[PDB]
Amino acid sequence: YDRHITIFSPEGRLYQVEYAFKATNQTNINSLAVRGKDCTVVISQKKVPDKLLDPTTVSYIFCISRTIGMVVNGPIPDARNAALRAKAEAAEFRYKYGYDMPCDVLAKRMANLSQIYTQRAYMRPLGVILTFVSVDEELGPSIYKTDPAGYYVGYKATATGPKQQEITTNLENHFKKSKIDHINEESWEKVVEFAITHMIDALGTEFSKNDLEVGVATKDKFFTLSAENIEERLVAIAEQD
């Protein structure tokens, strides 16, 4: 009974949650996010290498209402279900309180729902880590990450997936050195190229318009890139250095 339901084990553990955490490595996808000066940028390794699939239908970047969006990793069904829970709450906070749902409160609100499934017996945790990004009217560029236990924290930059230790070490060694606590560029054209550069450094593989998914937040909108805009940013890295 100690491993089938979310109840304290002999060592004070919850094994159901450790199993929802292993579901977050299931897709073999890595995602990366960085704050700029006026933007926040998120990358995901699209990875459809060997199939009859239709890549304009395989995605893990979900926009939430207007100015907010997220990358999910973990199984695609639980990712879409988490997106449904994230778009309904941003839409009804905007009804109740008369202003646009701030990302900090959406991350808290998704983390508190995950505390239900983390205490109840008859409900299962979602097997996903949710990485919310936006540019707030107060705190500016924002990253917040939520996990199957209902824990959440804001970030300067973050990585999630099988290879997150590599990406996080390369990010840390950059912020440790430039000492700004964000990527110091005035436009999203240079923060996507920093993000793709440091992702290609960490995975050990170069990227194409077929290995990449990219989303950008700026204070007017969250927008996913099309594969032709990723093509400009690949041509621009290759041209620069």
């Binding site: 199993y19 929802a20 292993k22 579901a23 009859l52 395989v58 199984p75 017996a121």
Partner: protein
């Protein structure tokens, strides 16, 4: 009712997919402006009423379904698909986009994979249609996990069938026209039955194409089916 495992895998989905592996084999082709659905039957007896018997279900004027797994589970999804797409008409006053239909069924099937009191649907569906963007084709699993596709196949015959679906799409860089797919799909279903040919089965094919069906779903009958059989028979011979 048993809901996570040491691999982070949903135990009751490990069981519910075993039914798909024992269901009737089927193929869907996304043609250059349409979808073609094709299937192998299980004629255990002549008692099976021909014509009355059908595997490819109408979900809406522009949408169809073929599925492998437990029959009441799939019948319930076809019934919920008929409710779902009709709910779109009754508010948005237009036919539903196929990716919206596919997401609504993915969210529906995923719902039962959560709680320790309901069953993961033991059925894989291939579904698709033609809409204001064009043709679309999607395959949905017992896990809830679905995605778009150039062509797909599922049920008993899946490995020989998927080897032939690659031999379509690697061989033609555009894929294929709706009237070519009617021939080419039948080649696969009689080929993938190689390990069961000590029993016989009926070919059934249906389609929707913006040109060849006016963008409305129709069955493939008579001379086209007979020409596809005369193709599939010369190709397997």
């Amino acid at each position: 009712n048993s809901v996570f495992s040491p691999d982070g895998r949903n135990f009751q989905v490990e069981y519910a997919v075993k039914a798909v592996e024992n269901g009737t084999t089927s193929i869907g082709i996304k043609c250059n402006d349409g979808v073609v659905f094709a299937v192998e039957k299980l004629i255990t007896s002549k008692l099976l009423v021909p014509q009355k018997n059908v595997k490819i279900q109408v979900v809406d004027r522009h949408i169809g379904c073929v599925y492998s797994g437990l029959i009441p589970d799939g019948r319930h999804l076809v019934n919920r698909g008929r409710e779902e797409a009709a709910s779109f008409k009754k508010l948005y006053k237009t036919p539903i986009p196929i990716p919206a239909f596919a997401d609504r069924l993915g969210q529906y099937v995923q719902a039962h994979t959560l709680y320790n009191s309901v069953r993961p649907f033991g059925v894989s569906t291939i579904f698709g249609g033609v809409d204001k963007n064009g043709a679309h084709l999607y395959m949905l699993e017992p896990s809830g996990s679905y995605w778009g596709y150039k062509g797909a196949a599922t049920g008993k015959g899946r490995q020989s069938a998927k080897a032939e679906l690659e031999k379509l799409v690697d061989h033609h860089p555009e894929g294929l026209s709706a009237r070519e797919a009617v021939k080419q799909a039948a080649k696969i279903i009689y080929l993938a039955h190689e390990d069961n040919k000590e029993k016989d089965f009926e070919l059934e094919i249906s389609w929707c194409s913006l040109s060849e069906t006016n963008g409305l779903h129709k069955f493939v009958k008579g001379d086209l089916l007979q020409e596809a059989i005369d193709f599939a028979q010369k190709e397997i011979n």
